Each structure stands twice: as C-alpha cells, then as structure tokens.
Amino acid sequence: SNATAQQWNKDVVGWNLGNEFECSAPGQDGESMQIGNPDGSIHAETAWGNPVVTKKMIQAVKKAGFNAIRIPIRWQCHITNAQAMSIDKAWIARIKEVVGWCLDNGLKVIINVHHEKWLESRPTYQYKEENCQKLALLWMNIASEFANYDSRLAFAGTNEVHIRDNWGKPTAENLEVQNAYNQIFVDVVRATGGNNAKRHLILQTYVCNPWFGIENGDFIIPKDAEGNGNNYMSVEFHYYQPWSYAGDCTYDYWGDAYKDAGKIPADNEKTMTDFFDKAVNTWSNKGLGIVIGAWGVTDHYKSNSEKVHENMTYYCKFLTTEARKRGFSTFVWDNNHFGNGSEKYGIFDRFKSMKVNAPWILEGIF
C-alpha cells in the first residue's frame, strides 16, 4: 500500500524502455524547446526508429529476470495548451496501457519527465519562474492522472538537467534552479493526496551526475510532507562510469581482474565501491533511497569480441551486485542499437521477437 523508498528499491534490478516514449515528435529536432501538440505526435514512439511497444515485449523483459521497468517519457510535444500544460488525452491513455502491461506482469514502474528540453536546457534565473510554473502544472496533471495506481508505480520528477552541450559542474545559479525543480515536484505531487501522499518519489542530481550532488550538500534533500521525513524519497543518478569504459570506447577492458587482457582505466573495482560507500554515507544513512536510473556498457571491441564480452559480463555482475547489497535499485539502459561503438546499448532486438542479441549483459546481471 505504502512502501518506503528503501523497501521499494530493495533487490530491484530493472530495465529501461529506451528511445520509445521520450522521442521527440515525428520529424522534430530533439533539442527543440517548443511546447505543443503537432499532428502525428501521438505516434512519436516510432520517431527514433524503434517499434510500437507491445505486451509481448514487456513479458520478454520479465522472463529475462528483470523485476522493474523504467519508462522514459517526453511531454513537451503532447501538450494541448501551453499555458496550462494540459496533456493530450490519447497520450495519457497510451502511457497507461504500457504501465498496465508492466503492472499486470509483476513489474515495478518508474515514469518520469525525460528530454523535456524547455526544462532541462534552461536552468537559469532568466527562465526559473516560467520553468517552475510549467513543471508544477505538468506534474499536477501527471500525478492526478496516475493517482490511483498503487505503490509499485514511482514518479521520477526530471531526468538530465544541464545547459546544452555542457556536461561540466553546474554553477551556483544552475544548482539553485535545478534543486528548485526537485522541491516543486515533491510539493505538487504530495498536494494531490491519496496514493500520492506516500508514493515513492525519485529526485535527480544535476545532469544525473552523482559527483555534482554528493559533495557539500550540492544536492538539497527536499522537505517532504509532515511525518514522511526522508523515507519516501530517493536520490537518482546515472552511472556510466568510468566514462572511458562504457561510454566513449577509450578502453576495451576494465578492472584489476582483467589487467592481463589489455589496458584498463585508472578507475577500478575499488574506486566504484568507494563511491557507492560514499553515497550510502551521504544519502542512504539519512533514510533516502538510491536509484541508479541508468547504467550500461556500450558494445565495443577493437580485436577480440569474446574476451571483451567476458569482461563486460564481469563489469555488469560487479556493478549490479555491489549496488544490490547496499539497497540500491539499478536500471540498465537499452536503446535497441547493436554494433561496435557509441550508443550501442541494445540488449534485446525489438524487431525480432525480443531475441537476446547481447547475452553477455544478461549473464552479468542474473
């Protein structure tokens, strides 16, 4: 009925329904900050080249072993009225259909506000008043539409807030605005009462980089509703680390265990568990949940695919299990892209009956 953040997160190893409901409107620039409802936008789940989601696809993520699905959702091209941030009824009905598929199959769900560029790209004093008013109206409508779902459904308020093409440390200005987003989100969802009084709410660090929130109280823990304390909130970050493995393909190998295979980044097993410990001390020990809302290693190999895919299996095992035994939930990124380079995070092929074209990832977890 009312699970706490830490209860909800416990043993949750999940999966992202990536590049589906967070696509920009058909034929629109993904960086665009425009709010409206272009014709055809109801079909935007195919705009980036992935299929219409079906029940069978959800069921295959279950059967693989996962127990939660995070659903990224863009809202800005589904707004019937930009002043009030009203949401296209058919878009809501479509989201509920997919959420219902997950819940009917014993999956926990995260729904969020993802690639919402009028919010993510303008964390500045100039746009604060407008972004805050619009975030409130948007979440007022989302929270009210999903008020009657039980606690298996959590809300994450935003995704990666940052100035465009800028992945560095926020300014004081950027931090002030983005922390204000998290507070507004909490206030608005709690003010709809009902099952939202104690629904698991997920808050983000700046650009979902843990290092931009873990120091100096950079990340501000919001004031929740009276008596809730911190027990019904989590801190979310994304953990594509070290970015040299996993991200930009500088190294093909990771860990002291695989030093004999090739060259490895300085960040090893210890730098990871050190960090996880530091997130326990900063946040968990205060009663907050910890959600790793995105992680993964992009499929990339110079020479010896076997040896690289084995090290990837060990990376996936080490990350999931070390997170799990500290009470974190994990959600692996999947964009349904396969190959050898950047942004090759596909696990299942969504065009071929959900066939597992990356068994080495699924060997790492599970």
Ligand X SMILES: OC[C@H]1O[C@@H](O[C@H]2[C@H](O)[C@@H](O)[C@H](O[C@H]3[C@H](O)[C@@H](O)[C@H](O)O[C@@H]3CO)O[C@@H]2CO)[C@H](O)[C@@H](O)[C@@H]1O
Residue ranges in contact with ligand X by CB under 6 A: 18-19, 30, 48-49, 159-160, 167, 208-209, 238-243, 294, 333, 335, 343, 345
C-alpha–C-alpha distance, residues 158 and 142, integer Å: 13
Comparison of 239 and 258: residue with beta carbon closer to ligand X: 239
C-alpha–C-alpha distance, residues 119 and 129, integer Å: 11
Residue 60 CB, shortest distance to ligand X, in Å, is: 20
Comparison of 55 and 169: residue with beta carbon closer to ligand X: 169
Q: Kindly provide the b/e burial profile for residues 328-364, where b requires at least 16 CB atoms within 10 angstroms of the residue's own CB.
A: bbbbbbbbbbeeeeeebbbbbebeeebeeebebbbbb
For the chain, the first-to-last Cα distance in angstroms comes to 28
Comparison of 150 and 215: residue with beta carbon closer to ligand X: 215
**Torsion on CA atoms 105, 110, 115, 120, rounded to nearest 10:** 180
Comparison of 3 and 312: residue with beta carbon closer to ligand X: 312
Comparison of 150 and 343: residue with beta carbon closer to ligand X: 343
Q: Give the phi and the psi of residue 68 in degrees, each rounded to 5.
A: -140, 155
- Which of 172, 245, 271, 268 is closest to 212 using CA atoms? 172
CA torsion through residues 130, 132, 133, 135, sign = positive
Residue 337 CB, shortest distance to ligand X, in Å, is: 6
C-alpha–C-alpha distance, residues 274 and 357, integer Å: 33
Residue 184 CB, shortest distance to ligand X, in Å, is: 21
Residue 342 CB, shortest distance to ligand X, in Å, is: 8
Using a 10 angstrom Cβ sphere, with 0-12 exposed, 13-18 middle and 19 or more buried, the burial of residue 148 is exposed
- Which of 23, 92, 12, 106 is closest to 58 using CA atoms? 106
- The residues facing 57 across adjacent strands are none
C-alpha–C-alpha distance, residues 219 and 178, integer Å: 9
Comparison of 49 and 51: residue with beta carbon closer to ligand X: 49
- Who's near 326: CB < 8 A, 6+ residues apart? 276, 277, 280, 284, 290
Comparison of 13 and 47: residue with beta carbon closer to ligand X: 47
Residue 283 CB, shortest distance to ligand X, in Å, is: 17
Residue 226 CB, shortest distance to ligand X, in Å, is: 33
Residue 22 CB, shortest distance to ligand X, in Å, is: 6
Comparison of 4 and 14: residue with beta carbon closer to ligand X: 14
Comparison of 70 and 108: residue with beta carbon closer to ligand X: 70
Residue 219 CB, shortest distance to ligand X, in Å, is: 15
Kindly report each contact of residues 97-106 with a partner whose C-beta sits within 8 Å and lies 24 or more positions away, as own/partner.
98/17, 98/21, 98/53, 98/58, 98/71, 99/71, 99/146, 99/149, 99/153, 101/55, 101/58, 102/58, 102/69, 102/71, 103/149, 103/150, 103/152, 103/153, 105/58, 105/59, 105/62, 106/62, 106/67
Comparison of 190 and 346: residue with beta carbon closer to ligand X: 346
